[PDB]
Design a protein that fits this description.
Radius of gyration: 17 Å
CATH topology: Green Fluorescent Protein
CATH architecture: Beta Barrel
Number of domains: 1
Strand order of the largest sheet: 1-2-3-11-10-7-8-9-4-5-6
Number of helices: 1
Shape: globular
Subunit structure: Monomer.
CATH class: Mainly Beta
CATH superfamily: Green fluorescent protein
Protein name: Green fluorescent protein
Largest sheet: 11 strands, mixed, barrel
Family: Belongs to the GFP family.
Structural class: mainly beta
InterPro entries: GFP, GFP-related, Green_fluorescent_prot
Distance between the termini: 20 Å
Keywords: Chromophore, Luminescence, Photoprotein
Length: 225
């Protein structure tokens, strides 16, 4: 509720990612706004180092679940906002089926009035001609359910989910996600019962933008209780 009060209005968001995938180094910067009352995020990301060496859709999940709309009856299950303003560390491993993996570490916290997501991504064991390094994925929305459970031993949560990315030939590239979040501060946080976040992300382009970029409109809602 201390943390939850920080999200009653529209909050500006900043995202900064430093990445290395099979030795291809890159940086992405993002800005936008989130409105947790509606579970709504609007963001624009730019590759600041030039051309992105992987498909934008593969970075969506990595590039602020504190903006999830938790129904009133599930408010005692919102770990993410309860960690604020000091924040949380989000770590993932993302296994691309028949290809490489991403490992990510992010810190999500407030800097003044701004919610900041600072990320390091490391990708290894990708195939030069695979769907990822070969840029064979469609620039398509992604939607799925993030399954959350408590992790008492680290005073945090774990999550797992699958994203099925459409491939240009009509097939699918599976990305299996394994997630862990832990608070940065030492204050109390809400450890939830099992539930999920229903998440939909729509991907678009800015017609006047010449840099490599992605525009995102996302809706995230807690459910399953």
């Amino acid at each position: 509720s201390k943390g939850e009060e920080l999200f009653t209005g529209v909050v500006p968001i900043l995202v900064e990612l430093d990445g290395d995938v099979n030795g291809h180094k890159f940086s992405v910067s993002g800005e936008g706004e989130g409105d947790a009352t509606y579970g709504k995020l609007t963001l624009k990301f730019i590759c600041t180092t030039g051309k992105l060496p992987v498909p934008w859709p593969t970075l969506v999940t990595t590039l602020v679940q504190c903006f999830a709309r938790y129904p009133d009856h599930m408010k005692q299950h919102d770990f993410f906002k309860s960690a604020m303003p000091e924040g949380y560390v989000q770590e993932r491993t993302i296994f691309f089926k028949d290809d490489g993996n991403y490992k990510t570490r992010a810190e999500v916290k407030f800097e003044g009035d701004t919610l900041v997501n600072r990320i390091e991504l490391k990708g290894i064991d990708f195939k030069e001609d695979g769907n990822i390094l070969g840029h064979k994925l469609e620039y398509n929305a992604i939607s799925d359910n993030v399954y959350i459970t408590a992790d008492k031993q680290k005073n945090g949560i774990k999550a797992n989910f699958k994203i099925r990315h459409n491939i240009e030939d009509g097939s699918v590239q599976l990305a299996d996600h394994y997630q862990q979040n832990t608070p940065i501060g030492d204050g109390p946080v809400l450890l939830p019962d099992n539930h999920y976040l229903s998440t939909q992300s729509a991907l678009s382009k800015d017609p006047n933008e010449k840099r490599d970029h992605m525009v995102l409109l996302e809706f995230v809602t807690a459910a399953g209780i």
